[PDB]
Ligand binder design. Structure first.
Ligand SMILES: O[C@@H]1[C@@H](O)[C@H](O[C@@H]2CO[C@@H](O[C@@H]3CO[C@H](O)[C@H](O)[C@H]3O)[C@H](O)[C@H]2O)OC[C@H]1O
Ligand SMILES: O[C@@H]1[C@@H](O)[C@H](O[C@@H]2CO[C@@H](O)[C@H](O)[C@H]2O)OC[C@H]1O
Length: 389
């Protein structure tokens, strides 16, 4: 009989949401039906609340983003946009660690690059897409195939130019949440003032690298978003592999509880290793996401809770401040069942519904949990995720 405690009085980060990437230039756009599967929150829908899109370097491509972005917004999502390269007339080449022909933004074009970003913001606004945020650069520190920014180039842009962007500014979107890319911004008062959202990717980011003390120190009034990952691999036709898919839930748990992230955004929504399969159905990896996205809605607040109450069991909890209700997401990676007494002191809640995913069922509604006082005794099937609501 393991125990856990959920402390509804110890509020952590406010949840902004969950979602993934659309890229209708590199791959096919989501279809009408796939837009609904991704951003609706009905039966057989993922309940995503964040769409990420790219800012094409060629403005003649911008129209390709509109249908999916508009539909996501109609269904209640917010949209964030990231550039990979500036327009070619703003780029120059340089040699980086002996590798020639690498791209950077010309320093003398920083003002023009702001205008490019602002033009994108205005174009999208004119088409019913009020962007929540725009990034300086996708993966400035992993730009073999796009545009590099050193930590200092990123800093100088954030300090000197980002205040001119007509949107919330996201930076720096390091590929692995490398703190050398973001520390300069947090330490410079002008750059920090111009920041709105600290964005990070999770490729190869270990749990020990998910906390960020400097952001805890300096980041008041800034959001913290995990804007791209796939886990645990991008193997072809892997999205239903079990128990590998449990790594998706675990990574989300870790982002939330170890990283204090307010948003978790996958790479391509529709892909053979993604949350939606090429046939338009939800994969096992997608149901992992859905355990969070369908239930932990924007504006819920994470609360302190025993994160790992017994070996191979992981727990997160979020509160709806409208009525102090609780959503708990509990991962059991063990090959045996686990029984846990979850204490929720001070709650007036006395019953939880539960939905369970395993290798053989998806979001199956199982028997209700009736509390004895403020303690909810739950039994977790082997190799499962359960959301309690
Ligand atoms: O020239 C273009 C290529 O650059 C492009 O290759 C893609 C580059 O992006 C990789 O996706 C990355 C996945 O990991 C993180 O989320 C990255 O930031 C993404 O950019 C893709 O796997 C490549 O296919 O292909 C299109 C071509 O026009
Ligand atoms: O798609 C790209 C990934 O392939 C890349 O993967 C990471 C590279 O660094 C390693 O230390 C990590 O283990 C690995 O996941 O991340 C960047 C992304 O653009």
């Amino acid at each position: 009989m393991a125990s856990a405690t959920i402390n509804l009085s110890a509020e952590k980060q406010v949840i902004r949401g969950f979602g993934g990437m659309n890229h209708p230039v590199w791959i096919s756009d989501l279809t009408p039906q796939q837009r609904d599967t991704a951003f609706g929150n009905g039966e057989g829908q993922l309940g995503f609340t964040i769409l990420r899109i790219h800012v094409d370097e060629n403005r003649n491509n911008w129209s390709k983003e509109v249908a999916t972005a508009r539909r996501a917004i109609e269904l209640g999502a917010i949209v964030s946009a990231s550039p990979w390269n500036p327009p070619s007339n703003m780029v120059e080449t340089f040699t980086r660690n002996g590798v020639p022909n690498q791209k950077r933004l010309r320093y003398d074009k920083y003002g023009d690059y702001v205008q490019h970003l602002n033009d994108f913001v205005a174009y999208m606004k004119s088409n019913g897409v009020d962007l929540y945020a725009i990034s300086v650069q996708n993966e400035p520190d992993y730009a073999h195939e796009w545009t590099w920014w050193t930590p200092q180039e990123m800093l100088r842009f954030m300090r000197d130019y980002a205040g001119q962007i007509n949107c919330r500014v996201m930076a720096p979107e390091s590929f692995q949440y490398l703190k050398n890319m973001s520390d300069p911004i947090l330490n410079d008062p002008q750059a920090l003032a111009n920041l709105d959202i600290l964005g990070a990717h999770f490729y190869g980011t270990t749990v020990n690298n998910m906390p960020y003390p400097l952001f805890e120190q300096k980041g008041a009034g800034k959001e913290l978003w995990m804007t791209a990952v796939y886990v645990p691999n991008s193997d072809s036709n892997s999205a239903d592999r079990w128990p590998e898919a449990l790594e998706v839930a675990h990574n989300m748990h870790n982002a939330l509880v170890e990283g204090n992230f307010q948003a978790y955004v996958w790479w391509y929504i529709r892909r053979s290793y993604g949350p939606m399969k090429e046939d338009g159905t939800i994969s096992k990896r997608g149901y992992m996401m859905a355990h969070y996205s369908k239930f932990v809605r924007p504006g819920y607040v994470r609360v302190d809770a025993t994160k790992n109450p017994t070996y191979n069991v992981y727990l997160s909890a979020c509160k709806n401040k409208k009525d102090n209700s609780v959503v708990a997401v509990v991962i059991n990676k063990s090959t045996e069942a686990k029984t846990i007494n979850i204490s929720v002191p001070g709650t007036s809640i006395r019953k939880w519904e539960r939905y369970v995913t395993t290798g053989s069922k998806n979001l199956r509604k199982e028997s209700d949990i009736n509390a004895s006082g403020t303690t909810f005794q739950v039994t977790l099937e082997p190799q499962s995720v359960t959301t309690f609501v």
